[PDB]
Design a protein around this ligand. Structure first.
Ligand code: ADP
Ligand code: ADP
Ligand code: ADP
Lengths: 604, 689, 604
DNA sequence: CAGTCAGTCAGTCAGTCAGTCAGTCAGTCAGTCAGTCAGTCAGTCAGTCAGTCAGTCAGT
């Protein structure tokens, strides 16, 4: 007997036992965790000769099970969480350790931002969201010691506790780190058998998209635990569900007190979820039921789907099919081939638009900013620290210099949507030269010489030099950002403003009826097209791009400028991407025809 | 709160037991209307103070409800297991319903009545004033009642009570009829695992103390605020208190000062005594133990010293340990609370009823020849000596005292000696008649000291101080004091006995006493002759070691000879061997009267006071002329006994007045006085053979 | 987990488990206790509609089982007793609570009297014997409280401990007798559910038969426990086996100390045995195997056993058969018949010898003092307090008067052997008149008027008045203690000193060969003859003692003196005793013949 | 010459009072202990200047 607990604790354990045996999915989840760790242990104990322990409980069911247990948890959680955890360890031990819970909700009008937190909400269960800054370092915490004795040869043992334990209180008893037992003998300690459990604390500010007009922000701080270390990098957007504990003696202990108001507050646990934002953080968690992949397989084998998905990104924009084809070929992105003992070769596609004003060149990039995943938009400026980190760190614990990522490091595997590309000064264009082929960013400022990684994809939309004169004088510097910047870009779409009468009609009823295939299927098509499967190139497609490339040199070197081997490499990239679209494995002549036609319309 | 001072569930509920105890309190029809509206109405009519809630009506109610349907919750064992909570729970179950107004108050009644009446009336007017205030400030009426009932301080119902409440244990008869709560235990048997139950003991009471008031609640006055600040006291010692604790002299700057008063507190009588072990239920080599008893309330003044009693009560702890260096924590030192007291040997004359009693008495009266039958009945297990038993019945009756307005008092009582040695079985009669009569003390020769059978002075524990602890004679007054071996007494004891021969008086002038205590006793003695036995060569008073003054103080003197005779020996041998063969003597045609019914008869007989007449005057006078006339014509130290003092005349009128009562008649006749002269002339003068 | 105990505790528990399952009588004893309490519980739960828990372990077996466990217990018992108790509760719980032990020995040269106790024997296991004085009162001790709450209706609970608990130490935590829980509510206590366990302490002095010549005695004190309350009345002789603990802080706590030497000592537990003495305490524990009662049944049915057992008490004394017959008739003692609603009638026999010096009258009474049980010898004086208690009590705790038994109260159901009966003054002879027929002792000294019980049996041996003149002048006062004292005694053996020549021979070779049926069988015959069975008298024996008694009056009233009805009653007593000798049930004429002849030789 | 009565010592019992031992206490005084403070020390943040680059004007 610990303290031979009361029949109240028996009442809570029996009732929650009845609920957990009422709905029977959770038993199957426990069975899945237990079998998976079992067979992993069989692989690690049989050939050569991980998953945590928590069950996600939703608060849907308890509202239709018991009002008492429902409104019991959301008011006083230090009386209702340790019984339910005790019964769940009873079930998991009986079917074949902590076994914590989650409480995914649906929360009870406790959806509050940390502006309105304190203080009559104290010691309840509260859900908080916001930005994460300024995440500290990971340190291990000690729980159990083990000592070897000399010379009698008996191990020993000791426990340790704290105030950030299970959620009740306890009359504290400190305990010296032992040495020289009775009778007097040296106790040489040991490691490897003495346990350790990790520990980390992060602080949370309220959202800037939700904040007031201009005021100072106000923030709280969260302690994490064993299986929650290192989920959220600083800069994310994070939902936290926990218990708003208030520990410490607030200066009422000793008289003539300083630290005028004590009772410092924090939040324990419990279930940090990262969530999707508009501009930072992955959204690849989107579900794929078997109905959905069965429908993808149903539409997967047609012969017009490139012309269906061409006209899918334009629900309300007239014309410009070939731009849409280029944007889908960007979102598929090609394949990445890293060599053995050399340098890798680049996979994606880079697109520049240029043309007259009022041509929906800025309306398009917001649409690519919505449908894709990890889009980051930079307009104008810029300096300092888009392509770099600027290294401004003043770490308080010790003299050390960290890095704070800009816009180029953070958008990895993503899309960067730059507007007004001519307004950039050349000093940042040095950094764009460093990104767009070298695929690395070397920073050796004060400092620490590093070489991190960033392999983004770039879309820009620049204005002409003077007027709308896109065809009048010559193509030779209507753009005027020479010359390597013209060569790094794959495609150069040149958009004009022709005047007609039929074009005025077709624009007219489109714009008029707009004031009065579907995309959340289309991105589920996209990610399944991306992870499976990479194609290989075959013999049927070499000679088309070889003959086509010698054609483009021997004649387009008589028409226009410039042509490098980078054109050949982008031919291979668009061939691979159009092979990815049809969910195939090999490469056909059809792909070389389509990419050939796109490069014809792009250049000529 | 969890994790410190935890919880436990048990099968015992206190929810439906209150409802069932209400249903038992209202609807019980067995003993005009229901049983407890009559007695409880009698309480509220202010003519009664105690309430006896037995443990038989509850059990009969459970068999009745068990056979009617539905199931009744088991309550009798729930009383027997705990028995302390149920006085308060039971008594707040009584107080919801009471037939209040059934008689207007008398003027000359009491003071406790009029105090509780003014507390009740002031309580009502205080409760009506607030609902006369808030109701006129608006803004079904149960809510306004709940408003008023929690903003008004009242006299709690623990203080306006007027009565007490006592349980009563169940017989073996009712437990036998339907199939424990009263098995008669001994003081060795009480293990330390009965603390809280409701048990029953038996033993002899010794050292019962005085009755002095002990405090329960203490009532102060505040003199400035006007409140009445009470205080309860549970412990042995308390402490007085200071400035105030009201709600008006508190939260002010100038606190008042309070001082007590004694016409508004609540007192209770209090008396403690001790039970010694019965000395028949002991193992072979041990000594009698003891166990204390507190007594509270109406039950006081029913514990006389030197009795045989059956006290039933509950058994609590009370904190103490002895020397400080012997404590180990948390030793407790028990006592026994009292609830209901039942005596063996029921004492006359504490009885009134006659109607049911005549069903047993009139059987003896209609049995025919009551007197010689009762004379046969005292100690039947010996043979012979019908005349000795005949006289000793007249000892047990006694009477009748007489005040002559001076007031000098006459007795009133009989004093009998016994003589002869050794095998005439005289000790059997002394144990016998000192077992039939209530309040009868048997002391041997030496034996008690001089200070053992007079009183002595000793300091008294907790109640104080300096009480005269009684001896043997002060213990047994209005009774019979048997005495063995009268010759071996110290001479101071002889003068004590001679002072008992004059009535009422023992006088002491020792080192701390100047008193004259009272003793209304009767003395039976048993002296042996001079060694060896009965020489008719030797004279009377030669074989007697006592002066003839002491022979004159005994109005009746006997002698039991021992002469070998052929005819009686076979009857005696068949008598005795007929009881070692069996355990009962008489046959053809007689049954012995049981002693309880006999004590009911003799206890009934002492309420007569007969009256003499004029023909018996002539007959008593002429008979006294006979005895006086022939008694003084011898004047010798021969077998004659001179000189027939007038104490024989007063003793023979007194024996006539004693024999007249067993006819139950107030009809003093000539068979009376003729019977008395027969016992006088046959009483002595048996030494002729 | 209490403290999640070590593998050392596991080693002791496993090893003692193996020993207890090695020898298998103890399992059968546990089975006997458990079945007996079970069927008693069936009687108390079935008709209407006790035994303690300890096993006696002998130290014979552990010396041939383990030397380590053997010499482990007798050196440091606070490390070896709680594991063995734990394993025994494991076995008793597993087959169907404390379950303590005994350790009956055979002790290891720790057989020491409390003169030589202190102090290098401290904190070991020690066996002590001596006299018991001055035994205190029995008080109950509290362990567990139970409180009812108002108004929420939940019971509560609390524990308590001390320093006289199980034999280790523990960091002490006191605990207030609770009232007013959180939140503030009155806690009215209860009784009946709160447990209580008894407690008693006695002190032990060394033996006076073992003491030095004349010195002051030195004494220790013993604490007892639950199932050991009230075994030994003060005056017994007691073997104690326990643990010589030394508790308390000895004045080293506070400085400038008084009580110059602290560290008060005592003995805990464990197994108080009362043992036989020479003069106080019963010896009726003597074993009766089935072989023994089969032999009693074998010798039980002969026709000479009264003449065999006549000559059994005289291995070395010539002559006097009829005295020996009278002494066996005393040791059987007759039967006791208590009437209904009257006074009882006496059962035993009282014997006086009288005669010339050098007649083995004092040698005989030592032999009756050895063979019987509960013999107490008083020679000469006497006053004060043989027949009384003298009431000398000065009880320290409170003003109260107790009793301290003399020689007459203490010898109940026994034999009192008084020598030199004439030297007693008559003031004590008043008390002998009170004992020998009234069978009660009434004491009303200061005081407390009582009537205790004492029903002894008396043997005396008085001298003649002057010279050896036992036959010369007359029997009328050669003794001279008249006259009721001659009548209370049943038999009056008158022993002379006749001179002869054949008698000189028969004495001579007897005394000569003495310098160069068996009694420890005979007392086992006696006690089985005593408890089973009482006889009843029958019709065949009335007329013999009726005719014989009228004979003795009509003729012995012509020869000698005196004859009362007490002679008739003693005829019935000797008839019943001689009926008890032959192990019968009824009464034959043979008994009346034998008792008749004994009274003839006794009187004539 | 033997019984007996009365005188006489002796042991034992009850009264007597002076030590004795346990429990409580208040005042004060001292022993330690904690709150005070002051000086140290590194970190950190705002002011300030120098260099370098984009804009703009004027010269050919
Ligand atoms: N082909 C078109 N169809 C529909 N709307 C168009 C089209 N071309 C331009 N627009 C209109 O032009 C506006 C956006 O102008 P845009 O060219 O994107 O900005 P900027 O030239 O500053 O980059 C939108 O409001 C949109 O209604
Ligand atoms: N008539 C009788 N009937 C029965 N028993 C008798 C009778 N006469 C004498 N006895 C016996 O004689 C004994 C007398 O002894 P008891 O009365 O105790 O004291 P005491 O010897 O002084 O009279 C009794 O025990 C009794 O058994
Ligand atoms: N009949 C006998 N047989 C053997 N020894 C005897 C006998 N009679 C006397 N004695 C001796 O007498 C001694 C005991 O003397 P005893 O008469 O008992 O003492 P007293 O007469 O002083 O009480 C013993 O040592 C024993 O040897």
């Amino acid at each position: 007997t610990f303290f031979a607990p009361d029949a109240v604790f028996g009442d809570r354990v029996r009732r929650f036992q009845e609920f957990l045996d009422t709905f029977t999915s959770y038993r199957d989840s426990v069975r899945s965790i237990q079998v998976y760790n079992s067979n992993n242990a069989a692989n690690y104990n049989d050939d050569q000769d991980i998953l945590p322990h928590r069950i996600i409980i939703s608060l849907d069911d308890l509202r239709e099970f018991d009002r008492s247990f429902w409104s019991g948890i959301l008011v006083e959680p230090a009386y209702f969480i340790p019984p339910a955890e005790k019964a769940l360890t009873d079930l998991a031990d009986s079917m074949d350790h902590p076994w914590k819970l989650s409480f995914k909700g649906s929360f009870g009008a406790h959806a509050l931002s940390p502006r309105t937190l304190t203080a009559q909400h104290l010691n309840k269960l509260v859900s908080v969201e916001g930005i994460v800054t300024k995440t500290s370092l990971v340190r291990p915490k000690l729980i159990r010691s083990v000592h070897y004795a000399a010379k009698t040869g008996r191990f020993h043992y000791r426990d340790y506790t704290d105030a950030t334990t299970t959620l009740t209180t306890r009359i504290p008893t400190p305990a010296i780190y032992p040495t020289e037992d009775t009778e007097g003998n040296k106790l040489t300690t040991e490691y490897g058998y003495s346990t350790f459990i990790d520990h980390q604390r992060i602080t949370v500010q309220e959202m800037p998209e939700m904040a007031p007009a201009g005021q100072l922000p106000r923030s709280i701080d969260v302690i994490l635990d064993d299986d929650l270390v290192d989920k959220t990098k600083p800069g994310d957007r994070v939902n936290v569900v926990g218990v708003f504990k208030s520990l410490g003696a607030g200066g009422m202990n000793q008289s003539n007190s300083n630290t005028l108001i004590g009772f410092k507050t924090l939040i324990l646990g419990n279930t940090v979820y990262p969530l999707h934002a508009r501009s930072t953080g992955v959204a690849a968690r989107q579900m794929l039921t078997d109905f959905d992949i069965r429908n993808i397989n149903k539409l997967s084998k047609k012969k017009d789907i490139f012309d269906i998905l061409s006209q899918s990104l334009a629900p309300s924009i007239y014309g410009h099919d070939h731009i849409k084809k280029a944007i889908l070929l960007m979102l598929m992105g090609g394949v990445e081939k890293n060599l053995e003992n050399g340098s890798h070769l680049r996979g994606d596609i880079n697109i520049l638009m240029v043309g007259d004003p009022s041509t929906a060149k800025s309306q398009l990039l917001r649409f690519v900013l919505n449908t894709a995943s990890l889009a980051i938009a930079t307009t104008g400026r810029g300096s300092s620290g888009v392509g770099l980190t600027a290294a401004v760190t003043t770490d308080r614990e010790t003299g050390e210099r960290r890095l704070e990522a800009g816009a180029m490091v953070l958008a990895d595997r993503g899309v960067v949507c730059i507007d007004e590309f001519d307004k950039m000064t050349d000093v940042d264009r040095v950094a764009i030269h460093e990104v767009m082929e070298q695929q690395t960013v070397t920073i050796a400022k004060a400092g620490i010489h590093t070489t991190l990684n960033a392999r983004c994809s770039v879309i820009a939309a620049a204005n002409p030099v003077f007027g709308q004169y896109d065809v009048n004088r010559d193509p030779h510097q209507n753009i005027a950002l020479p010359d390597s910047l013209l060569s790094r870009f794959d495609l150069l779409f040149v958009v004009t403003d022709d005047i007609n009468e039929i074009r005025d009609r077709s624009i007219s009823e489109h714009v008029l009826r707009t004031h009065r295939v579907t995309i959340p299927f289309l991105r589920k098509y996209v990610q399944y097209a991306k992870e499976r499967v990479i194609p290989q190139l075959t013999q049927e497609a070499i000679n088309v791009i070889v003959k086509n490339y010698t054609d483009l040199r021997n004649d387009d070197n008589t028409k226009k400028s410039p042509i490098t081997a980078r054109t050949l490499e982008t031919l291979i990239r668009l061939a691979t991407a159009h092979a990815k679209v049809r969910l195939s494995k090999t490469v056909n002549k059809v792909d070389a025809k389509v990419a050939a036609n796109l490069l014809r319309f792009a250049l000529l | 709160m969890s994790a410190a001072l935890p919880s436990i569930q048990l099968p015992v509920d206190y929810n439906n037991l209150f409802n069932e105890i209400t249903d038992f309190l209202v609807t019980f029809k067995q003993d005009k209307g229901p049983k407890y509206m009559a007695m409880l109405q009698k309480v509220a009519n202010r003519e009664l103070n105690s309430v006896i809630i037995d443990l038989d009506d509850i059990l009969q109610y459970q068999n009745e409800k068990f056979l009617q349907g539905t199931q009744a919750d088991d309550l009798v064992s729930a009383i027997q297991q705990n028995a302390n909570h149920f006085t308060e729970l039971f008594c707040r179950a009584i107080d919801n319903n009471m037939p209040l107004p059934t008689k207007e108050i008398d003027y000359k009644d009491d003071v406790l009545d009029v105090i509780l009446n003014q507390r009740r009336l002031r309580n009502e007017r205080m409760l009506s004033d607030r609902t006369n205030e808030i109701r006129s400030e608006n803004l079904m009426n149960d809510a306004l009642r709940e408003v008023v009932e929690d903003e008004t301080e009242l006299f709690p119902p623990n203080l306006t009570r007027r009565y007490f409440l006592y349980f009563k244990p169940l017989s073996q008869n009712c437990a036998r009829r339907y199939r424990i709560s009263s098995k008669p235990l001994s003081v060795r048997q009480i293990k330390g695992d009965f603390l809280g139950q409701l048990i029953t003991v038996r033993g002899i009471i010794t050292r019962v103390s005085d009755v002095k008031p002990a405090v329960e609640v203490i009532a102060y006055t505040c003199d400035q605020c006007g409140y009445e600040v009470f205080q309860e006291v549970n412990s042995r010692t308390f402490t007085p208190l200071s400035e105030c604790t009201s709600e008006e002299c508190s939260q002010n700057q100038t606190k008042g000062q309070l001082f007590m008063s004694t016409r508004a507190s609540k007192f209770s009588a209090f008396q403690e005594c001790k039970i010694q072990e019965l000395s028949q239920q002991v193992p072979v080599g041990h000594i009698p133990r003891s166990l204390n008893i507190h007594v509270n309330g109406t039950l006081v003044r029913s514990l006389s010293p030197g009795d045989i009693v059956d006290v039933t009560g509950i058994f609590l702890p009370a904190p103490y340990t002895g020397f400080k260096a012997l404590k180990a924590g948390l030793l407790t030192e028990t006592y026994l609370e009292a609830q209901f007291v039942r005596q063996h040997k029921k004492k006359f004359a504490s009885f009134s009823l006659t109607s049911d009693v005549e069903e047993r008495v009139m059987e003896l009266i209609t049995s025919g020849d009551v007197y010689n039958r009762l004379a046969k009945s005292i100690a039947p297990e010996i043979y012979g000596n019908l005349d000795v038993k005949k006289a000793l019945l007249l000892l047990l009756v006694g009477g009748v005292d007489k005040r002559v307005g001076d007031g000098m008092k006459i007795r009133g009582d009989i004093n009998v000696c016994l003589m002869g040695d050794p095998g005439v079985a005289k000790s059997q009669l002394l144990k016998a008649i000192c077992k039939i009569s209530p309040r009868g003390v048997y002391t041997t020769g030496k034996g008690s000291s001089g200070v053992g059978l007079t009183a002595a002075v000793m300091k008294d524990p907790v109640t104080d101080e300096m009480i005269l602890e009684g001896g043997a004679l002060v213990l047994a007054d209005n009774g019979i004091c048997c005495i063995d071996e009268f010759d071996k007494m110290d001479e101071s004891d002889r003068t004590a006995i001679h002072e008992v021969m004059e009535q009422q008086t023992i006088s002491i002038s020792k080192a701390g006493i100047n008193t004259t205590l009272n003793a209304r006793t009767s003395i039976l003695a048993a002296a042996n002759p001079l060694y060896g036995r009965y020489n008719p060569r030797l004279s009377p008073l030669d074989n007697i070691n006592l002066p003839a003054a002491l022979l004159s103080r005994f109005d009746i003197l006997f002698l039991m000879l021992d002469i070998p005779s052929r005819d009686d020996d076979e009857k005696l041998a068949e008598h005795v061997t007929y009881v070692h063969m069996h355990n009962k003597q008489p046959d053809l045609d007689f049954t012995p009267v049981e002693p309880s019914k006999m004590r009911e008869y003799i206890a009934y007989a002492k309420t007569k006071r007969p009256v003499m007449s004029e023909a018996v005057n002539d007959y008593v006078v002429q008979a006294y002329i006979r005895l006086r006339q022939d008694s003084k014509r011898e004047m010798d130290s021969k077998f004659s006994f001179g000189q027939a003092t007038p104490r024989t005349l007063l003793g023979i009128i007194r024996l006539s007045q004693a024999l007249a009562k067993l006819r139950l008649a107030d009809m003093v006749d000539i068979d009376d006085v003729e019977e008395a002269l027969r016992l006088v002339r046959v009483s002595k003068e048996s030494l002729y053979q």
